[PDB]
């Protein structure tokens, strides 16, 4: 009875992660006994054994690990050291490799199999599909195998590069967008790839004060959770009228309580149904999507499409958890996305110059203010950036906004200007 | 010649199913046929079905190989993962949908579901976004996989059917680094410590950069010790966040008996009907009780069931609270309000509450 | 004997009209008869009419004596003031109400009004709460009495009739200290500076306790200069709040060309229909232009007229914005939104936004 | 004219403060000229002259003043000094005396005539009815007249004591309450008086880190704005059912759109009208007052009355303006108000021990936490104190809340428990 605590977790209908680890050890060791080119066959069983001790102790058995990477890069590999390194030698080193996913996590079977072959050769055989940022996670290899593994990945027929970690541009991710979704207001997947490609250096070679994440949602439903999990959330939107098929609205009206499930749930009362015609006051509409989510055969986003950029989203450390807020109410999204890239690169230049060690962009904006942030990106303040104007009178004014006066001359005279 | 670098991920468009590739950005309407299966109709009149399956996120490469075998048979050698770590197949023959479901369950043991239908207003419970825990991370207070396993065994029937009147995201973080969307989920499980760090003077001298460690404490509980070349901790100011351990291996705060999880509630990401919301603590602490965490699991279920029994169609947890108030929420969920739930995290600016953390505004 | 001390205010019960003393706490109902006149009916059958008049707050003792003569003639020697500094008389003989009104208008020039009637839903504009301004205070950015007069001259018709669809409090703070509930008014006029202090080192050395002056700065723009035993200002951090001058005569920051008023809107004290709210800046700055402040007055009127033309019955300004949103507010009022209006007051804790600043809650 | 700017403000329909100042100057000067005992007959005219200059310069001509007081007190009188005191010596010292009002500002003419006679003798003749806190303001006197003015005040047939100022208990204030208002849930006037008398020492002799203000509103309409400008807002409430007279509701219904003006405006949808019977679900009611304000002949506050106490209300400095928040959901308000007094004395003892120089009670609570505050007042945390539970997991736990453990034992051994 090797793993009695973990064994209980193979019972039950939800697919078991313990069954995932047990299969990996059992087949990896089978491969290495069969003479397959496998460098860490004892990888998964060692992990299983450690996790069992962890369960007993009710604590982790991993410690702070060395800085370990592939040649040419500074990010993408997370070093992990076991403190049971002598009792369980096979997990003494157990590093992760973050492998950049294709946009929208779309795969061909060939692409996936290449990944499997390489990782079977060099690692534990354990993966995550996917790590939260979006990357494929290769879970557990030794320091020696990092560079040869990466060589093999980049030598594949369909090759995969390393994603981001550390104080770099993290791997961008995107909702499925136009590939499957009729709500998509721009090509999320192309945007995501183009960004990933354009900023390869910034992703591979951390040079920034801290991490930076970009996520791309095709409409306000935000299916990659960009506003909470990215510093720079590109969320699709439109500027014109919601397209209304009155015929299709009647089809819904024949079975759906439109009054209660649509009209009364509109946050702004923009949408009216009298039993004959659906009317949307698009001036009142805040494009929350509810009515479109409700009657997708009848209601479509407008034809003037782009995105709203929300800035600052992050987990709590250090200054509190952030759902991103309105930075650019509307930007066009068209290849080569020069307008978006212009914004990003200005943000990075500024952040790199002004950011403190481990200061996220959201915290930088809180520290420096929206005026400085908007000047950096060359945009003007907009009422849409706030839920409400400030509740206190303590406003900063630019020197040049002041009326020339004996007082201002005194400030200038003293070099306090 | 050496080694190729800076080449990026493979181009997604090359890894697309022909029907998807052909009808790219030219879709008419989707239709949720039944739990786990979504019909997608192109303007060209082409029809495809996207079939969704729960995964344990952590996969054996041999499970991925099996998924690839499945994908070759039913989905033209194509599949995707979702932003909640479910996996989706693309079926063009409606008669073959049910077969695929059976073979996924027989081969890899993955359930069909994790979908919802806003049109009818019936919702499934989808996968739980989660992190590394005792599997790979050095800063966790709880396991991830173990708890996710325990919770989803208990809540299984909500994944495979449309039993809920609105969307409910469950999510988990193994520590306050709160990796994932845990801080904006309808129900969130967050690993917390309840004990301050006991400084290891030797390890701090050898391995830690003192000023950056001190600067990482949100409460300023940390100060450099000069005549000992180390860090001093003021226990009265410490709320056991563990950030100092992230910075410095000489600052552990793990107590197996007092580490555990807080349960938070009422986050929301979407814009539909009402603005996004950050989750709120409603249960301060539950113990680690591996391998089944029965205390943790009981409360999550207790919270979910109370919400489901009372919520109107589309009325997500935060929206339900908007209607009834927190007084009635605590009564109905049978939970205790204690001083712990009164927010005291001082550093966060009030002005953030005035920023528009939402895409909802008028033109 | 020695001088009497610690004897407190005269006991109010002794100073009540006998009909008020008699019926104290035994009222059936009130009825607003016409602007400025409220009928109150006691359980005993007694009826008394409370007749209200606007005042400039600053009163001559000679005006107080004239009010006393009027009270002796019409209200049996009794009167009161209200919490907005209107004055009220008590009349038992209904046939004398108009005689009282005409006499007050004739003798002291105080208009009957400043009432509202929630029942019919027609509201007067009552008096503007305000404080000392240049009449008595050393820290004002704007005058109080002059602006109140210029504003009430332009809005006078709203005081004497019930012409508004909801309550609208206009209130004035001559500096950021407020000295009143100005920060929770429907329309608030608030004196601000726009220039940093220039330390007077000699004055600071002689008169200012340095540590406490430094601790008074909400932005940490002040630091002690030990070498010169004084204080240095980091002008880049200062937003001209003036608190350091309250503390320290050596930190003045007044500039007659740049001092002026911000106009804030959307505050609320009562619970009725909607929680209380702090007011919000919508005009960053208007100059002082004594004696009539035409720019300031134009904006107050522009705001009040836009609200009144568009508000539903009982819909106060904040409630109107609740309905239409800030985008429309700025359009309909004709106001420009600029970066100044984005809150950046760092020190206030986010957690205050989670406290219940309201008596509205369920038992 | 000597006052061409201020003369502009004698024009227009609203009663002119300029006229009040000139009337005072004219009649004080006349009284003095007639041989009446008037110490400062030129004070009002000096004030006028200063103000005209302030109008031209667009700035104050007042400076920080000295500390001045009546004998035996340290608050209630604020020194004010003119910077024009060489040009206008009659305003060089121009102090205010704050004079405690009767509860609810109820006066007899005998009371007011006494105050007029005393201030005519000793001060400028200018007053404010009333100071924002509630006191009568005697606006402008000299240091040498403060004590004799106070002795005369104390010797009036209806005598008046000084109110508060500085780091003391300020003069409490109260809405008219049951003197006139059928809404009043407790005796605002009696409580205000009893607190004023109970804490005469705290009011007259500042002993605290900063000011502390108490205001008493008879019901949640809060007609004294207690929640924005008192630290301790005592706001009438009830715990049982709203009283409903059905015949009277029907009378309203003959003319009033009850649906749109009452029912749809209830914040919680507690109150319903079907044309025959008004129903209120008092469990849903949050006692906002709106329905009772709408139908005062039909609807009354319930019979089980008391108050809610809101804590912290204050102007901006230093840490931001505060509408006070729920500290005590319900306390009984029955003479001699021992329960209220017990809370106040506990808060004061704690705040005096712990408070920094010029730290308001609201700020001290933000710094120390609600847990400490609640222990001080011997009350338990209640959900009604928050609009929402915390949005982050960063909670403190009590030592005795923890499980006994080896770690907790280590903490003891290290000396950190
Ligand atoms: C790889 C991944 C595991 C997972 O399954 O969650 C990961 C795991 C770790 N994260 Fe993360 N984060 C992962 C996504 C996230 C996300 C969500 C997202 O990116 O979509 C967040 C919230 C968004 C954000 O960044 O704020 C997140 C917020 C953090 C935190 C908090 C940062 C903050 O400002 O509060 C720390 C950052 C730190 O330690 O400096 C962190 C750091 C870490 C470290 C390096 C642990 C540490 O404290 O040093 C992690 C290593 C675990 C290991 O060795 O196995 N991770 N982390 C996640 C991504 C895999 C991928 O590459 O695709
Ligand atoms: C498959 C997936 C996209 C992707 O993988 O790239 C997806 C796909 C769709 N989402 Fe989503 N959403 C996906 C993540 C999300 C998540 C994001 C998350 O949880 O991290 C939520 C945001 C969570 C939140 O709001 O807190 C999300 C917010 C929505 C909203 C929810 C509206 C609401 O009631 O608040 C819409 C509207 C709806 O219900 O149709 C939506 C609807 C949709 C639609 C119906 C759009 C369409 O026209 O087809 C897609 C089908 C989902 C369904 O089952 O009905 N999707 N969607 C997502 C993966 C999740 C999964 O496996 O279950
Ligand atoms: C006399 C006075 C109390 C006092 O002790 O002096 C008073 C007296 C009444 N108030 Fe008040 N309130 C008085 C200041 C206030 C203030 C405090 C302030 O403005 O600084 C407010 C809080 C203002 C705010 O909410 O921002 C106040 C908000 C109310 C409310 C709420 C109206 C709303 O729709 O929000 C009611 C309800 C109503 O309209 O009948 C009200 C209703 C009343 C009633 C009708 C109560 C009753 O049953 O008789 C009294 C007659 C008012 C009228 O004109 O219809 N009283 N009332 C106050 C006169 C000020 C003046 O001269 O205009
Ligand atoms: C006389 C009075 C204004 C009036 O014309 O009615 C007044 C006038 C002054 N107030 Fe006040 N306050 C008056 C009520 C208030 C109120 C309202 C209240 O009490 O109902 C507030 C808001 C509540 C509060 O206290 O926060 C108020 C908030 C302040 C502030 C800011 C407090 C803060 O924490 O921000 C200051 C500055 C300070 O405390 O140093 C202050 C300080 C002052 C000073 C002493 C000036 C200063 O910068 O040091 C004022 C002296 C004027 C003079 O010498 O003639 N006064 N002050 C009001 C008191 C008269 C009375 O006894 O009835
Ligand atoms: S964010 Fe919008 S475009 Fe993307 S999958 Fe979700 S609903 Fe579709
Ligand atoms: S998208 Fe939302 S805001 Fe716009 S009309 Fe539809 S339901 Fe209303
Ligand atoms: S949430 Fe914490 S414990 Fe979990 S993977 Fe992230 S850093 Fe590690
Ligand atoms: S655990 Fe957090 S609060 Fe405690 S000393 Fe470390 S960083 Fe500071
Ligand atoms: S608000 Fe400012 S200027 Fe007006 S009296 Fe109070 S402290 Fe003086
Ligand atoms: S004016 Fe205000 S912000 Fe500027 S230095 Fe003085 S206290 Fe600080
Ligand atoms: S607060 Fe209530 S009791 Fe007091 S006057 Fe106003 S309505 Fe009447
Ligand atoms: S008092 Fe307010 S919450 Fe209660 S029923 Fe009346 S209107 Fe509704
Ligand atoms: O690894 S974390 O930084 O996403
Ligand atoms: O005088 S003020 O501080 O109330």
CATH code of A390's domain: 3.30.413.10
Beta bridge partners, B81, equal B87
Resolution in A: 1.8
Domains of chain C are 1-113 (3.30.70.3340), 114-194+254-363 (3.30.413.10), 195-253 (3.30.70.20)
Q: Which residues fall within 8 angstroms of residue A244, CB to CB, at 6 or more apart? A: A278, A280, A298, A299
CA distances from C250 to B205, D67, D318 (A): 47, 17, 19
* Interchain contact A403–C (C-beta under 8 A): yes
Q: Which domain-ending residue is among D284, D305, D326? A: D305
C269 phi, psi to nearest 5 deg:
-100, -45
Q: How many residues does chain C have?
A: 363
**Same domain as D148, residue D68:** yes
Mutation target to probe the D interface, by most D beta carbons within 10 A, among C12, C127, C145, C185 is C12
Helix, strand, coil % (nearest 5) of chain C?
35, 20, 45
Nearest-angstrom CA–CA distance, A22 and A10: 10
Compare all CA atoms of chain C with the CA of A384 and give the residue at the minimum distance.
C327
DSSP string, C195-236: S-----HHHHHHH--HHHHHHT-TT--EEEETTTTEEEE-TT
Q: Which residues fall within 8 angstroms of residue D3, CB to CB, at 6 or more apart? A: D18, D48, D49, D52
* Residue given tokens 């939970």 in the structure block: B335
Nearest-angstrom CA–CA distance, D66 and D69: 10
Written as six digits, the tokens of C224 are: 């002690």
Helix and strand numbers, DSSP H then E, in chain C = 11, 14
**Same domain as D112, residue D18:** no
Q: Number of structural domains, chain A?
A: 4
Q: Answer yes or no: are the C-beta atoms of C90 and C79 closer than 8 Å.
A: yes
| Nearest by CB: C349 against B325, B327, B346 | B346
Q: Is D290 exposed, middle or buried (0-12, 13-18, 19+ CB in 10 A)?
A: buried
Q: Is B168 annotated as a binding residue?
A: no
Written as six digits, the tokens of D321 are: 């303006």
**Same domain as A394, residue A335:** yes
Q: Which of B189, A301, B264, C48 is nearest to D390 (CA)?
A: B264
Beta carbons within 10 angstroms of residue D205's beta carbon: 17
**Same domain as D221, residue D168:** yes
**Same domain as A336, residue A212:** yes
Strand segments, DSSP code E, in A25-161 are: 62-64, 77-78, 80-82, 95-99, 106-108, 126-128, 136-141
User: Whose CA is closest to atom 1 on ligand 14?
Assistant: D165
Handedness of CA B245, B248, B251, B256 (dihedral sign): positive
| Nearest by CB: C344 against B327, B345, B351 | B351
Written as six digits, the tokens of A4 are: 């009695």
User: Whose CA is closest to atom 6 on ligand 10?
Assistant: C244
Q: Which of B44, B115, B60, B53 is nearest to B90 (CA)?
A: B53
C39 phi, psi to nearest 5 deg:
-85, 130
User: Cα-Cα-Cα-Cα dihedral of C313, C319, C320, C325, to 10°?
Assistant: -160
Taking phi first (over 0 means left), then psi (-120 to 50 degrees means alpha), and beta for anything else, what does residue C215 get? alpha
Q: Answer yes or no: are the C-beta atoms of C159 and C114 closer than 8 Å.
A: yes
**The three-state (H, E, C) secondary structure of chain D, written as one string:** CCCHHHHHHHCCCCCCHHHHHHHHHHHHHHHHHCCCCCCCCCHHHHHHHHHHHHHHHCCCCEECCCCCCCCCCCCCEECCEECCCCCCHHHCECEEEEECCCHHHEEEHHHHHHHHHHHHHHCCCEEECCCCCCCEEEEEECHHHHHHHHHHHHHCCCCCCECCCCCCECCCEECCHHHCCCCCCCCHHHHHHHHHHHCHHHHHCCCCCCCECEEEECCCCCCCCHHHHCCEEEEEEECCCCEECHHHHHHHHCCCCHHHHCHHHCCCCCEEECCCCEEECCCCCCCCCHHHHHCCCCEECCCCEEEEEEECCECCCCCCCECCEEEEEEECCCCCCHHHHHHHHHHHHHHHHHCCCCCCHHHHHHHHCHHHHHHHCCCCCCHHHECCCCCCCCCCCCHHHCCCCHHHHHHHHHCCC
- For residue D345, whether the previous peptide bond is cis, meaning omega lies within 30 degrees of 0, is no
- Which technique? X-ray
CA distances from D391 to B189, B238, B299, D101 (A): 13, 18, 18, 45
Pairing of strands B78-81, B122-123: unpaired
Q: Which residues fall within 8 angstroms of residue D66, CB to CB, at 6 or more apart? A: D79, D81, D143
| Nearest by CB: A320 against D320, D321, D392 | D392
Written as six digits, the tokens of A63 are: 């410690």
CA distances from B135 to A64, B138, B175 (A): 14, 9, 13
Written as six digits, the tokens of A263 are: 């009209």
Q: Do C340 and A320 lie within an 8 Å CB cutoff? A: no
Strand segments, DSSP code E, in chain B are: 27-34, 37-42, 47-53, 58-60, 78-81, 87-91, 116-117, 122-123, 170-173, 187-192, 222-225, 230-233, 260-265, 280-287
Q: How many residues does chain B have?
A: 363
| DSSP label at residue B111 | P
Looking at residue D80, which CATH number applies to its domain?
3.30.70.2500
Nearest-angstrom CA–CA distance, A101 and A131: 10
CA distance D287 to chain B (A): 14
Q: How many residues does chain D have?
A: 417
Q: Which domain-ending residue is among D35, D61, D87? A: D61
Q: Angle CA(D20)–CA(D24)–CA(D26) in degrees, nearest 5? A: 115
User: Whose CA is closest to atom 16 on ligand 1?
Assistant: B179
Q: Answer yes or no: are the C-beta atoms of A129 and B64 closer than 8 Å.
A: yes
Q: Answer yes or no: are the C-beta atoms of C70 and C13 closer than 8 Å.
A: no
Contact B214 CB / ligand 8 (< 6 Å): no
Contact A211 CB / ligand 13 (< 6 Å): yes
CA distances from D132 to C85, C131, C171, C179, D321 (A): 9, 7, 11, 7, 17
**Same domain as A275, residue A190:** no
Q: How many residues does chain A have?
A: 417
* Interchain contact C348–B (C-beta under 8 A): yes
**Same domain as D38, residue D2:** yes
Nearest-angstrom CA–CA distance, D253 and B131: 61
Q: Do C111 and D385 lie within an 8 Å CB cutoff? A: no
Looking at residue A55, which CATH number applies to its domain?
6.10.140.1420
| DSSP label at residue A64 | E
Beta bridge partners, C89, equal C51, C79
**Closest-approaching ligand to the CA atom of A186:** 5
Nearest-angstrom CA–CA distance, A229 and A221: 14
Contact C20 CB / ligand 9 (< 6 Å): no
Written as six digits, the tokens of A173 are: 């991710």
Nearest-angstrom CA–CA distance, C74 and C97: 8
Q: Is D4 exposed, middle or buried (0-12, 13-18, 19+ CB in 10 A)?
A: exposed
- For residue D130, whether the previous peptide bond is cis, meaning omega lies within 30 degrees of 0, is yes
Beta bridge partners, D136, equal D99
Nearest-angstrom CA–CA distance, C274 and A389: 19
The tally of CA atoms less than 13 A away on the side-chain side of residue D324 is 33
| DSSP label at residue A388 | S
Pairing of strands C222-225, C187-192: unpaired
Q: Which residues fall within 8 angstroms of residue C2, CB to CB, at 6 or more apart? A: none
CA distances from B363 to A147, A286, A382, C96, D141 (A): 52, 8, 11, 57, 58
Q: Answer yes or no: are the C-beta atoms of B126 and B136 closer than 8 Å.
A: no
What residues of D are in contact with residue A391 (Cβ under 8 Å)?
Answer: 321
Written as six digits, the tokens of D255 are: 């003319």
**CB contact residues (below 8 A), chain B span 301-360, against chain D:** 325-327, 330, 337-346, 348, 350
* Interchain contact A289–B (C-beta under 8 A): yes
Q: Which residues fall within 8 angstroms of residue B329, CB to CB, at 6 or more apart? A: B282, B320, B321, B335
Beta carbons within 10 angstroms of residue D349's beta carbon: 11
User: Cα-Cα-Cα-Cα dihedral of C23, C25, C26, C32, to 10°?
Assistant: 90
**Same domain as A264, residue A294:** yes
Beta bridge partners, C286, equal C261
Q: Answer yes or no: are the C-beta atoms of D133 and D115 closer than 8 Å.
A: no
Nearest-angstrom CA–CA distance, A94 and A77: 11
Looking at residue D272, which CATH number applies to its domain?
3.30.70.20
Q: Which of A138, A128, A171, A5 is nearest to B129 (CA)?
A: A128
Beta carbons within 10 angstroms of residue A281's beta carbon: 13
Strand segments, DSSP code E, in A301-403 are: 305-311, 325-331
Q: Which of A321, A412, C229 is nearest to B218 (CA)?
A: A321
CA distances from D54 to C148, C344, D58 (A): 16, 32, 5
| Nearest by CB: C241 against A374, A394, A414 | A394
Mutation target to probe the D interface, by most D beta carbons within 10 A, among A316, A406, A407 is A316
Beta bridge partners, C60, equal D126
**Same domain as D137, residue D70:** yes
The tally of CA atoms less than 13 A away on the side-chain side of residue D306 is 14
Helix, strand, or coil here: A122? helix
Written as six digits, the tokens of A231 are: 């510093």
Written as six digits, the tokens of C144 are: 């109080």
Q: Which of D116, D152, D179, D20 is nearest to C69 (CA)?
A: D116
**Same domain as D101, residue D129:** yes
**Same domain as D53, residue D83:** no
Q: Answer yes or no: are the C-beta atoms of C253 and C236 closer than 8 Å.
A: no
Q: Do C183 and D321 lie within an 8 Å CB cutoff? A: yes
Q: Which of D195, D188, D36, D193 is nearest to D117 (CA)?
A: D36
* Residue given tokens 């945007």 in the structure block: A191
| DSSP label at residue C43 | T
Q: Which atom of ligand 10 has the smallest separation from the CA of C251?
A: 6
User: Cα-Cα-Cα-Cα dihedral of B51, A126, A128, B265, to 10°?
Assistant: 100
**Same domain as D316, residue D403:** yes
Q: Which residues fall within 8 angstroms of residue C111, CB to CB, at 6 or more apart? A: C36, C53, C54, C105, C156, C159, C160, D13, D14, D15
Q: Which domain-ending residue is among D61, D87, D113? A: D61
Written as six digits, the tokens of A77 are: 């590999």
Q: Is B112 annotated as a binding residue?
A: no
Range of the domain at D143: 62-163
Helices (H), chain C: 18-23, 61-74, 97-108, 145-154, 156-160, 201-207, 210-215, 243-247, 294-310, 317-324, 326-333
Q: Answer yes or no: are the C-beta atoms of D143 and D68 closer than 8 Å.
A: yes
**The three-state (H, E, C) secondary structure of D203-223, written as one string:** HHCCCCCCCECEEEECCCCCC
Beta carbons within 10 angstroms of residue A416's beta carbon: 16
Calculate how far, in angstroms, residue D348's C-alpha sits from the geometric centre of ligand 11. 28
Taking phi first (over 0 means left), then psi (-120 to 50 degrees means alpha), and beta for anything else, what does residue A72 get? left
Burial state string for D358-384 with b = 16 or more CB within 10 A and e = fewer than 16? bbbbbbbbbbbbbbebbebbebebbbb
């Amino acid at each position: 009875s090797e793993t009695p605590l973990l064994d209980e977790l193979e019972k039950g209908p939800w697919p078991s992660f313990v069954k995932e680890i047990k299969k990996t050890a059992e087949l990896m060791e089978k491969a290495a006994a069969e003479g397959k080119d496998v460098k860490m066959p004892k990888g998964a069983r060692g992990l299983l054994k450690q996790l069992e001790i962890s369960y007993k102790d009710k604590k982790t058995h991993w410690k702070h690990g060395g800085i370990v990477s592939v040649v040419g890069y500074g990010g993408g590999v997370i070093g992990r050291y076991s403190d049971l390194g002598e009792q369980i030698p096979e997990v003494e080193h157990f590093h992760t490799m973050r492998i950049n996913q294709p946009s929208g996590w779309f795969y061909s079977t060939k692409a996936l199999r290449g990944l499997c072959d390489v990782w079977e050769k060099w690692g534990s055989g354990l993966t995550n599909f996917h790590g939260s940022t979006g990357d494929i996670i290769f879970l557990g290899t030794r320091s020696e195998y990092l560079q040869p593994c990466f060589e093999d990945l980049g030598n594949l027929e369909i090759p995969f590069d390393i994603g981001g970690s550390g104080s770099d541009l993290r791997t961008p991710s995107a909702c499925m967008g136009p590939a499957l979704c009729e709500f998509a207001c721009y090509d999320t997947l192309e945007l995501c790839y183009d960004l990933t490609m354009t900023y390869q250096d910034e992703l591979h070679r951390p040079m920034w004060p801290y991490k930076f994440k970009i996520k791309c949602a095709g409409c306000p439903n935000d299916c990659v959770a960009s506003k909470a999990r990215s510093d720079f959330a590109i969320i699709g939107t439109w500027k014109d009228d919601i397209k209304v098929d009155q015929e299709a609205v009647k089809e819904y009206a024949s079975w759906m309580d439109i009054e209660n499930e649509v009209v009364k749930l509109c946050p702004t009362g923009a949408i009216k149904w009298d039993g004959k015609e659906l009317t949307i006051d698009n001036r009142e509409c805040v494009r929350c999507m509810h009515c479109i989510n409700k009657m997708p055969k009848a209601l479509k986003p407008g034809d003037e499409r782009g995105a709203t950029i929300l800035i600052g989203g992050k987990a709590p450390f250090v200054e509190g958890a952030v759902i991103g807020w309105v930075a650019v109410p509307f930007v066009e999204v068209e290849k080569p996305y020069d307008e978006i890239k212009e914004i990003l690169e200005a943000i990075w230049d500024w952040w790199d110059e002004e950011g403190k060690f481990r200061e996220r962009i959201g915290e930088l904006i809180w520290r420096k203010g929206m005026r400085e942030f908007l000047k950096v990106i060359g945009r003007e303040a907009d009422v849409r950036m706030v839920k409400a104007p400030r509740n206190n009178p303590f406003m900063f004014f630019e020197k040049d906004e002041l009326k020339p006066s004996a007082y201002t001359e005194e400030l200038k005279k003293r070099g306090m200007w | 010649e050496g080694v190729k670098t800076d080449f990026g991920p493979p181009y997604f468009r090359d890894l697309l199913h022909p029907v998807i590739a052909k009808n790219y950005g030219k879709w008419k309407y989707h239709e949720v046929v039944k739990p786990g299966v979504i019909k997608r109709v192109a303007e060209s009149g082409d029809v495809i079905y996207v079939v969704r399956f729960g995964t344990p996120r952590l996969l054996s490469i041999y499970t991925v190989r099996e998924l690839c075998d499945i994908a070759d048979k039913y989905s033209d050698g194509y599949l995707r993962w979702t932003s909640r770590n479910n996996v989706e197949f693309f079926v063009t023959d409606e008669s073959k949908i049910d077969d695929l479901i059976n073979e996924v369950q027989e081969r890899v043991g993955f359930p069909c579901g994790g979908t919802w239908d806003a049109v009818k207003g019936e919702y499934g419970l989808s996968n739980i976004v989660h992190t590394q825990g005792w599997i790979h991370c050095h800063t966790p207070a709880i396991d991830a996989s173990g708890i996710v396993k325990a919770v989803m065994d208990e809540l299984y029937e909500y994944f495979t059917d449309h039993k809920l009147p609105a969307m409910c995201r469950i999510s988990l973080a193994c520590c306050a680094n709160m990796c994932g969307a845990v801080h904006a989920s309808d129900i969130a499980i967050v690993g917390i410590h309840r004990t301050p760090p006991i400084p290891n003077d030797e390890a701090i001298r050898k391995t830690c950069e003192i000023p950056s460690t001190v600067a990482a404490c949100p409460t300023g509980a940390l100060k450099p010790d000069m005549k000992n070349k180390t860090i001093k901790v003021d226990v009265e100011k410490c709320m056991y966040c563990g950030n100092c351990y992230t910075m410095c291996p000489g600052m552990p705060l793990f107590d197996p008996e007092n580490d555990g999880a807080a349960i938070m509630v009422g986050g929301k990401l979407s814009e539909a009907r009402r603005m996004p919301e950050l989750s709120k603590v409603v249960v301060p602490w539950v113990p680690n009780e591996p391998p089944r965490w029965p205390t943790l699991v009981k409360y999550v279920k207790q919270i979910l069931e109370a919400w489901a029994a009372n919520a109107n169609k589309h009325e997500r947890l935060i929206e339900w609270v908007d209607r009834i108030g927190w007084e009635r929420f605590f009564e109905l969920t049978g939970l205790e309000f204690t001083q712990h739930l009164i927010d005291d995290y001082r550093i966060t600016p009030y002005f953030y509450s005035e920023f528009r953390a939402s895409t909802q505004f008028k033109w």
